[PDB]
Write a protein that binds this ligand. Structure first.
Ligand code: CDL
Ligand code: CDL
Ligand code: U10
Ligand code: PC1
Ligand code: 3PE
Ligand code: 3PE
Ligand code: HEC
Ligand code: HEM
Ligand code: HEM
Ligand code: HEM
Ligand code: HEM
Ligand code: FES
Lengths: 379, 164, 52, 239, 56, 379, 110
C-alpha cells in the first residue's frame, strides 16, 4: 500500500508543487505576492469570462453592451468593476513582485527571471487590449496613439500598423480582433506561469538573507498555505474597498463617453500602470528613440542578472545599494506622476531627468555601488 | 545517400511551399478587409461647403478637413509669411485650388483641438502647444515638426473634388 | 563573456565555424526574402521576377 | 405530400475543376437587376464584388450610379438622396419586411445572397422551379393568388411567373428564351452564394497536385526510416 | 553518378541542405504556380474573366 | 556535461513524451488517430481564433459577421470552411479513436479511459455551442430543441433551462454566453488532453496483439513521429478535399437562412455527429427516459472496463466477439441514419430496435460472448 | 482544543457566508437580465375590446391575436369534431375563456 498523495500522478505533481515543497522558513510577506498574482489571474480568468458572455465586440454595441452589463444585468456592475480594479491590483502585485525579485537577488534564478520578463510583456499587452475593449473615448484614442507609435520602425514599421489595425485606422476589425486576442492571451499567461513555477522548483525559493537555506527548509502545506490564504484575503480586502466604495477611482472619467473619431479628449493618458513608460516615451523627442526606450524600459530587467557584481546576492546587507534601490522606486513613481501631467514646463525637463536617472541607476549606479561595496568588505 | 536525401529534400521543399502559402493565407486574412479598401478609395466630396468655412469628414478613417477658403482668403494666405517658419509651402503649392484646401486631420505633436475655421493666426490655433496651423495647414506660430500632410487627389472638377 | 572567451583556440574555432554560420545567415536571408515575397530583391532576380 | 426533387442538370460549373461561365454571370446579373430585383433583394452583395467577375470598373461605376441609394444625415438634419457608387450594396426593393409582405399577396421574397446555398438541391432546384410552372392537376384548386409549382414545397408558391419567353433583351444579343434566362440567372445566383467558386476550385487543383507529390515521398520517407524495423530478422539462441 | 556528385556537393552539409531547400522552393513556387494556373485556365477556357476581358 | 535533451527541466518532459518515449514496435495505423485528434484540435484552435477575429456575437449581426467572413475578408472562406470541416473530421477521428480503444482492449488503462470519456463530453458540448454560433435557422432551432430537452429533469427542469438560455428563449443572452463558453472550453480540452497523455505514459501503450510490449519498445523519434506526420498528411488530404471540393457536403443548407424565431424548418436534424444520440433520444417515448438514455449512451463507455471478462486483453484473437463489435459499428451507423430521418412509421420501430440492440451488445451480448470463448479455449 | 477549533469554526463559517454570496452573484449573473424580464416577461393584455375583435399585439417576439370569440363562434368551435381535426386538441381543452381566446399570431407551416 502506498500513500495516494505521493503516488498518484496528478497528486504527486500537486504534492511536489504546493504541499510538501521544501520552502525557507524566513520567507517574508513580500513573497506572498507570488501566489496573489495567480489568484488575481484566476479571478481575472473568471470575471472576464462572465464579462465575455455579455459583451458584443462591435463598435456600435460595445459601449451599449458595457452599459447593459453595468445596469441591466443581475449583479453585473460588481463583475465589471471587479475586472477593472482587479487589473489595477494585478499590476500592483506584479510591480511589487518585480521589486522583490530585484531586491533579494532572485534574478540569480535565470530561467525563472526570463520567464517572468516574458510574463510581464504578455500581461501588459493583454491589459492594453482589454482597456481597448470597452470602446470609450480614452480607449479609442489611446489605442490610436499607441498603435501609431509602431510607425517609427524603419521600412516595415508602416506596414505593421494597418496589419494590427485591420484597416486604415482603429475601427471595427481592431476592436473585434482585440477582443479575440484579449480572450486568448491570459491562457498563454497561465501556461507561462506554470512553466515559471516549474523552473522555480528546481532551485527553490530565495530567502531574504540570500544565502542557501537548504538546512532550514519547512513543508509548504501547514505553514505557507495558511500564510498565502491570509495574503489573498488581505488583498481581497483592498480590492473590495476599490470596487465597492470608489470603483472609478483608478481610471479616467472620459472613458465613460462613447468613442468618437472626431474629438480628441482634452486629457490623454494610458492607464495608471502604463504612465511610467509613457513618461520615457514623451521624454525622447525622436519617435524611434521613444519606441526603443519603451521596449528597453522593460527589457532592461534581462540585463539585471549580468550586471550583478556584489558578492552578496541579497540586498539585506547592502545599505548604499538599498538607498539606490529606493531612489529607483521613487524614480518610477516620479515617472508615473510625470506621465499623468501634460507635457509642459517644468514637467518636460523633470521627465527627461527622471528617465536618464532611471536608466543610469539600473545600468551604472548599481554595479559601481556593488563594486565599491565589495572593495569595502575585503572581497 | 544522395537518393535518400533527395527524397527528403523534395519533401522539404513541398512542405515549405505549403507552409508559406498557408501562413500567408492567415496573415492576409488578418490584414485589411476588402470592404475597408473599398471605403479607402476615392471619396465623394461635393459642393456643400460654402466659402471661408472649414468642415470635416472621416475619409480613410481619419478626420479630414476640407476648408473652402474664399478667393479673398486666397489673397489673405498670399500675405501669409513663409520663409521664417518651418514649412513655408505656399498654399498655392499644396492645393491646386486654394479655394478648396484639404488636409488629413491629426495634429502631429500631440495637440488639443486647434480651433477650426479661420483661426486667429490664419486658419487655426492649436491650444496644447504652439504651431497653430495656418489656413493651408502649415505651422504658423511654432516650429512643430510638420504640418498636417495633404492627401493626394485626382479632383474631377470644381465643386466636384474627389480626394482618395 | 570576458577574457575567458578571448584566446587563440577561440579565434581558431571562430574561423572554423565562420563559413557555416555565414551561409546559415545566407539561408536565413533567402528564407526571409522568400517568405516575405520581398520585391526589392525579387525584381532583380531571373525567372522568379516574372511572378509580378 | 411528396417532394419532387430537382433532377441533376449538367451545369458547366458542375465539374470537379470547372468554374462558372463568367459571361453567363454577366447575362445572369441583368435578369436579376431587371426582373428579380423588382421584388427580391441581394442585400449581402455590393457592386464592388461585381467588378472583375462579370464587369469592369467603369461599367460597375455606371451601373452603380444608375440606381439611387440612401446616405446618412446631411448637414441639415435629414436624409439626402445620392446616386450609388462602388461601395453600395444591392438596393433593397422594399423599406422593411412588413412592407415586403404587404406589397405581395402576403409572402416574403427571400434574399438571393444564399438561396442556392439554402435550398436543398441548389441550382437544379431554382432553375427547375422557374421552369416548373404548369396548370394545376385536376382535383387541386389553389386559392386566388396562389400559383402551382411542383418543385416548391407544398406546390402553392405565391410567385407570379417571373420568366416568360422574351422577357428582356440581352446586351450581347443571345436569345431571350426562358430556358436561357433561367440558366444564366441560376449561374449568377450560384456565384452570389459562392463567390470563391473559381478560386476554391483553383486552390483544390493545386492541392490535388502537390499532395499527389508529397504523399508518396513522405511515404517513401517513412518506409525509408522504418525499414530497419521491417528487416529485423530476429534469432533465438538459448543454451 | 549524378546523384553521387549531387550529394558530395550540396547535401553533406545540413546548412547547405537548407540553402538548397530554400533556393529550390524559390523556383518551385514559381514553376508550380505557373503550371497549375496553366492547367486551370486550359480546363476552363473561355469562361474565366481573364479570357473574356478583351470584349469590354 | 549532459545532453540538453535530458538536462533542461522543460526539455525533460518533451523528450520523455515524444523523443525517447518507449512505444510498442507493432503499433498499427489505428493508433495514429491519437495524434490526428490533437493536431486537429490545434487547427480548431488556430482557425477558431481567426473566426473570433471577425465576429460579433450579436443576434442582429452574427450571421452578417459570418457572411462578411466568408465573402469579404481575405481568404475568410478558407478559414471558415476549414474550421467547420475540421470539427466534423475531428469527430470522425474521435469515433475511430473510441473504436480502437474498444477493440484492442485499451479500456484496461482506466484513468486514461475515464479522462477520454470526459474529453468526449467536453468536445460534444463545444461542437454544440459552435453550431449555435452562426445563428442560422437550423442553429437556432436545434439549440432550442436540445436545450428544451433539459426540461425533462424533474423539479429543477424549467429553472435550469431558463438558466442555460440566459432568459426566456434562445436570444441575445444565449448566443453571447455560448460564444464565450465555446472560447474557454477548448483550452479545458487541451489541459485535459495533457492529463490524458500523462496518465497514458505511465502504462506505455496497448499494441494490437494486446500482450505487453515492454520488451519490444522502440524510440519514438525516428519512428512514429514520421508515421504520425504521414497520418497528419492523410488527414490534411481528407480535410482539404472536403473544404476545397464540397465545403457544405456535411452540413444542412437550411442553416444559410437567417435564424427566424417564427418559422420552424421542415427538419430539425442536428449535425451529423450527434444524431447517433439524438436518434436514441427520439426512441424513448418518455422525455426524462429519453434524456437519461441519451446521456447513458455516452456514459456506457465508463462501464466498459468493468464488463470485460475475456481473459485476453485484445480483440485480435476473439472472432465471435469481433462479429459482435462490427455489429455494434453497424448499429451506430444505423442510429445516425435514423436520426437523420424523420419520425415516421418505418423509422420509429427501426430506431427502437437500433437503440435496444446497441445497448444490448455493450451490456449483455459482449460479456456473455466473452464467457463463451473462455469456456471454448479451456479456461 | 475547543478554543482553537472555535477560532477555526468562526473563520470557516464566515468564509462559507462570503463564498455563497460570491458564487450566487455569478449564478444570478447567469440568470435572466433585467431587460429580458421586462419585455419578454409577462406583458399584461387588455379586455376592454369588443366582441369578435382580434386585438393586434406584438409580444414575446411574435404577434398576439387575442380575439373575443362570440357565442356563435364558441358553439361552432365546440361542435367541431376533434377527431377530423389535424390537431388532437378540443376547443374547450385549448381555451380557458371560451369568449376570450388568445393565440400567437404566427401560423405554423411558415
Ligand atoms: C512605526 C510605523 C511606521 C511603519 C513601520 C514599518 C516600517 O516602515 O518598517 C518596519 C518594517 C519594515 O522593515 P524591516 O523589518 O527591515 O523589513 C520587514 C520585511 O519587509 C518583512 O515584512 P513582514 O513579512 O514582517 O510583514 C510586514 C510587511 C508587509 O508588507 C506588505 O504586506 C506589503 C506592503 C504593504 C502593502 O511590511 C513591511 O515590512 C513594511 C511596512 C509596511 C507598512 C507601512 O515593517 C514592519 O515592521 C511592519 C509594520 C506593520 C504595521 C505595524
Ligand atoms: C479491396 C478493398 C480494400 C482492401 C480490403 C479491406 C478489407 O476488407 O479488410 C481490410 C484488410 C484486413 O485488415 P488488416 O490488414 O488485418 O488490418 C490491419 C490494420 O488493423 C489496419 O491496417 P494497417 O494499420 O496495418 O495499415 C494501414 C491501412 C489501413 O488504415 C486504416 O484503416 C486507417 C486509415 C484509413 C481511414 C480509416 C477508415 C478505413 O491503410 C491502407 O490499407 C491504405 C491506406 C489508407 C489511408 C492511409 C493510412 O486490410 C487491408 O486491406 C489493409 C488495411 C485496411 C484498409 C482499409
Ligand atoms: C504512440 O503514442 C503516441 C503518438 O502517436 C500515436 C503521438 O503522436 C503522441 C504525440 C501527440 C501529440 C503531440 C498531439 C496530441 C497531444 C495533445 C493534444 C496534448 C496537448 C499538447 C500539445 C503540444 C498540443 C496542443 C498545443 C497547443 C494548444 C503521443 C504522446 C503518443 O503517445
Ligand atoms: C524586414 C525584411 C523585409 C520585409 C518586407 O517588407 O519585405 C517586402 C514585403 C513586400 O513588400 P515590398 O516588396 O513592396 O517591400 C516593402 C515596401 N514597403 C516598405 C513600402 C512596405 O513585405 C511584406 O510582404 C510584409 C512586410 C513586413 C514583413 C515583416
Ligand atoms: C515597504 C516600505 C518599507 C520598507 O521597505 O522598508 C525597508 C525594509 C528593509 O527590510 P530588510 O531587507 O529586512 O532590511 C535589512 C536592513 N539591513 O523592507 C524592505 O526593503 C522590503 C521590501 C523590498 C522591496 C520589495 C518590492 C516592492 C517595493 C515597492 C514597490 C516598488 C515598485 C517599483 C519597482 C519594481
Ligand atoms: C469499415 C471499417 C473498418 C475499416 C478497416 C478494415 C478492417 O476492419 O479490417 C479488419 C481489421 C482487423 O484487425 P486485426 O486486429 O488485424 O484483426 C485480427 C483478427 N484475428 O479490423 C481492425 O483493425 C479493427 C479496427 C477497429 C477500430 C477502427 C474501426 C471502427 C471505428 C468505429 C467508429
Ligand atoms: C427572377 C430571375 C427570380 C428568381 C431567381 C426568383 N424570384 Fe421570386 N418570389 C416572389 C414572392 C412573392 C415569393 C414568395 C413565395 C414563397 O416563398 O412562398 C418569391 C419566392 C422565391 C423563392 C423561394 C422559393 C423557395 O424554395 O422557398 C426563390 C428561390 C425565388 N423567388 C427566386 C416574388 C417575385 C417577383 C414579384 C414581382 C419577381 C419578378 C420574382 N419573384 C422573380 C424571381
Ligand atoms: C490577464 C488577466 C486580465 C487582465 C489584466 C484584464 C484586463 C482588462 C482590463 C483592464 C479591461 C478594461 C476594463 C474596463 O475598461 O472597464 C478589460 C476588459 C475586458 N476583459 Fe479583460 N483582463 C484579463 C483577462 C480577461 C479574460 C481571460 C477575458 C475573457 C474571458 C477577459 C475579457 C474582458 C472583456 C470582455 C472586457 C471588456 C469588458 C469591460 O471592459 O468592462 N479579460 N480587461
Ligand atoms: C504572470 C505573473 C506572475 C506569476 C503568476 C508568477 C508566479 C510566481 C510565483 C507563485 C512565485 C513564487 C512566489 C514568490 O517567490 O514570489 C514566483 C517566483 C518568482 N517570480 Fe514570478 N510570477 C509572475 C511574474 C513574474 C515577473 C514579472 C517576474 C520578473 C521578471 C518574476 C520573477 C520571479 C522570480 C525571480 C521568482 C523567484 C522569487 C524568489 O526566489 O524569491 N515573476 N513567481
Ligand atoms: C474543440 C474544437 C472546436 C470545435 C469542435 C469547434 C466546432 C465548431 C463548429 C462545428 C462551428 C460551427 C461552424 C459553422 O457552422 O459554420 C464552430 C463555429 C465557431 N467556432 Fe468553433 N470549434 C472549436 C474550437 C474553437 C475555438 C478554440 C474557437 C475560438 C478561438 C472557436 C471559435 C468559433 C467561432 C467564432 C465560431 C463561429 C463562426 C463559425 O460559424 O464558423 N472554435 N465551431
Ligand atoms: C480530445 C481528444 C483526445 C485526444 C487528443 C487524445 C489523445 C490521445 C493520444 C495522443 C493517445 C496516444 C495515441 C493512441 O494510443 O491512440 C491516446 C490514447 C488513448 N486515448 Fe485518447 N485522446 C482523446 C480522446 C479520447 C477518448 C474519447 C477516449 C475514450 C474514452 C480516449 C481514450 C484513450 C485510450 C484508452 C488510449 C490508449 C490507447 C492505446 O494506447 O492503446 N481518448 N489519446
Ligand atoms: S500641440 Fe498641435 S502642434 Fe504641438
Amino acid at each position: 500500500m502506498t500513500n495516494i498523495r505521493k503516488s498518484h500522478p496528478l497528486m504527486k505533481i500537486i504534492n511536489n508543487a504546493f504541499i510538501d515543497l521544501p520552502a525557507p522558513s524566513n520567507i517574508s510577506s513580500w513573497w506572498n505576492f507570488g501566489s496573489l498574482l495567480g489568484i488575481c489571474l484566476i479571478l481575472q480568468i473568471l470575471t472576464g469570462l462572465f464579462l465575455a458572455m455579455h459583451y458584443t465586440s462591435d463598435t456600435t454595441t460595445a459601449f451599449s453592451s458595457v452599459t447593459h452589463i453595468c445596469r441591466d444585468v443581475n449583479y453585473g456592475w460588481v463583475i465589471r468593476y471587479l475586472h477593472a480594479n482587479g487589473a489595477s491590483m494585478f499590476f500592483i502585485c506584479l510591480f511589487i513582485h518585480v521589486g522583490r525579485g530585484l531586491y533579494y537577488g532572485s534574478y540569480m534564478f535565470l530561467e525563472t527571471w526570463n520567464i517572468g520578463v516574458v510574463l510581464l510583456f504578455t500581461v501588459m499587452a493583454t491589459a492594453f487590449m482589454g482597456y481597448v475593449l470597452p470602446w470609450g473615448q480614452m480607449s479609442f484614442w489611446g489605442a490610436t496613439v499607441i498603435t501609431n507609435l509602431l510607425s517609427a520602425i524603419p521600412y516595415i514599421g508602416t506596414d505593421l500598423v494597418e496589419w494590427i489595425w485591420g484597416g486604415f485606422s482603429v475601427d471595427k476589425a481592431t476592436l473585434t480582433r482585440f477582443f479575440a486576442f484579449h480572450f486568448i492571451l491570459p491562457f498563454i499567461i497561465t501556461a507561462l506561469a506554470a512553466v515559471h513555477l516549474l523552473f522555480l522548483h528546481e532551485t527553490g525559493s530565495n530567502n531574504p538573507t540570500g544565502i542557501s537555506s537548504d538546512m532550514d527548509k519547512i513543508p509548504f502545506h501547514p505553514y505557507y498555505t495558511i500564510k498565502d490564504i491570509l495574503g489573498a484575503l488581505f488583498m481581497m480586502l483592498i480590492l473590495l474597498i476599490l470596487v465597492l466604495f470608489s470603483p472609478d477611482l483608478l481610471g479616467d472619467p472620459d472613458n465613460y463617453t462613447p468613442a468618437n473619431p472626431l474629438n480628441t479628449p482634452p486629457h490623454i493618458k494610458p492607464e495608471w500602470y502604463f504612465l511610467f513608460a509613457y513618461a520615457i516615451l514623451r521624454s525622447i523627442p525622436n519617435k524611434l528613440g521613444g519606441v526603443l526606450a519603451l521596449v528597453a524600459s522593460i527589457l532592461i530587467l534581462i540585463l539585471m542578472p549580468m550586471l550583478h557584481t556584489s558578492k552578496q546576492r541579497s540586498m539585506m546587507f547592502r545599505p548604499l545599494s538599498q538607498c539606490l534601490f529606493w531612489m529607483l522606486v521613487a524614480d518610477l513613481i516620479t515617472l508615473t506622476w510625470i506621465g499623468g501631467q501634460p507635457v509642459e514646463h517644468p514637467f518636460i525637463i523633470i521627465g527627461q531627468l527622471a528617465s536618464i536617472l532611471y536608466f543610469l541607476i539600473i545600468l551604472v549606479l548599481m554595479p559601481i555601488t556593488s563594486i565599491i561595496e565589495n572593495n569595502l568588505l575585503k572581497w | 545517400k544522395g537518393f535518400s536525401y533527395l527524397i527528403t529534400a523534395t519533401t522539404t521543399v513541398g512542405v515549405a511551399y505549403a507552409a508559406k502559402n498557408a501562413v500567408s493565407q492567415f496573415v492576409s486574412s488578418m490584414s485589411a478587409s476588402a470592404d475597408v479598401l473599398a471605403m479607402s478609395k476615392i471619396e465623394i466630396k461635393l459642393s456643400d461647403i460654402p466659402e471661408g468655412k472649414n468642415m470635416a469628414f472621416k475619409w480613410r478613417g481619419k478626420p479630414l478637413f476640407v476648408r473652402h477658403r474664399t478667393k479673398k482668403e486666397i489673397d489673405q494666405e498670399a500675405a501669409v509669411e513663409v520663409s521664417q517658419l518651418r514649412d513655408p509651402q505656399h498654399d498655392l503649392e499644396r492645393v491646386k485650388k486654394p479655394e478648396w484646401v484639404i488636409l488629413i486631420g491629426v495634429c502631429t505633436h500631440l495637440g488639443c483641438v486647434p480651433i477650426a475655421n479661420a483661426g486667429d493666426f490664419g486658419g487655426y490655433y492649436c491650444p496644447c502647444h504652439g504651431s497653430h496651423y495656418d489656413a493651408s495647414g502649415r505651422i504658423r506660430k511654432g516650429p512643430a515638426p510638420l504640418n498636417l500632410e495633404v492627401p493626394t487627389y485626382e479632383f474631377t472638377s470644381d465643386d466636384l473634388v474627389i480626394v482618395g | 563573456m570576458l577574457s575567458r572567451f578571448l584566446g587563440p583556440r577561440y579565434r581558431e574555432l571562430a574561423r572554423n565555424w565562420i563559413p557555416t554560420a555565414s551561409m546559415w545567415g545566407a539561408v536565413g536571408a533567402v528564407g526571409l526574402v522568400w517568405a516575405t515575397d520581398w520585391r526589392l530583391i525579387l525584381d532583380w532576380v531571373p525567372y522568379i521576377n516574372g511572378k509580378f | 405530400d411528396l417532394e419532387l426533387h430537382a433532377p441533376s442538370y449538367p451545369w458547366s460549373h458542375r465539374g470537379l475543376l470547372s468554374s462558372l461561365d463568367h459571361t453567363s454571370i454577366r447575362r445572369g446579373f441583368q435578369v436579376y437587376k431587371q426582373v428579380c430585383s423588382s421584388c427580391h433583394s441581394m442585400d449581402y452583395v455590393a457592386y464592388r464584388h461585381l467588378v472583375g467577375v462579370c464587369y469592369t470598373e467603369e461599367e460597375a461605376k455606371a451601373l452603380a450610379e444608375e440606381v439611387e441609394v440612401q446616405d446618412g444625415p446631411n448637414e441639415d438634419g435629414e436624409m439626402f438622396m445620392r446616386p450609388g457608387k462602388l461601395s453600395d450594396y444591392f438596393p433593397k426593393p422594399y423599406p422593411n419586411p412588413e412592407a415586403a409582405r404587404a406589397a405581395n399577396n402576403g409572402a416574403l421574397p427571400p434574399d438571393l445572397s444564399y438561396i442556392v446555398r439554402a435550398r436543398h438541391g441548389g441550382e437544379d432546384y431554382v432553375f427547375s422551379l422557374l421552369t416548373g410552372y404548369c396548370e394545376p392537376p385536376t382535383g387541386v384548386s389553389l386559392r386566388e393568388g396562389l400559383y402551382f409549382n411542383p418543385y416548391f414545397p407544398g406546390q402553392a408558391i405565391a410567385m407570379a411567373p417571373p420568366i416568360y419567353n422574351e422577357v428582356l433583351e440581352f446586351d450581347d444579343g443571345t436569345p431571350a428564351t426562358m430556358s436561357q434566362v433561367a440558366k444564366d440567372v441560376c449561374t449568377f445566383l450560384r456565384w452570389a452564394s459562392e463567390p470563391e467558386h473559381d478560386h476554391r476550385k483553383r486552390m483544390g487543383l493545386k492541392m490535388l497536385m502537390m499532395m499527389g507529390l508529397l504523399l508518396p515521398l513522405v511515404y517513401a520517407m517513412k518506409r525509408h526510416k522504418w525499414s530497419v524495423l521491417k528487416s529485423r530478422k530476429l534469432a533465438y539462441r538459448p543454451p | 553518378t549524378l546523384t553521387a556528385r549531387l550529394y558530395s556537393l550540396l547535401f553533406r552539409r545540413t546548412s547547405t541542405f537548407a540553402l538548397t531547400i530554400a533556393v529550390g522552393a524559390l523556383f518551385f513556387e514559381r514553376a508550380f504556380d505557373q503550371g497549375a494556373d496553366a492547367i486551370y485556365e486550359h480546363i476552363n477556357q473561355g469562361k474565366l474573366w481573364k479570357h473574356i476581358k478583351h470584349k469590354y
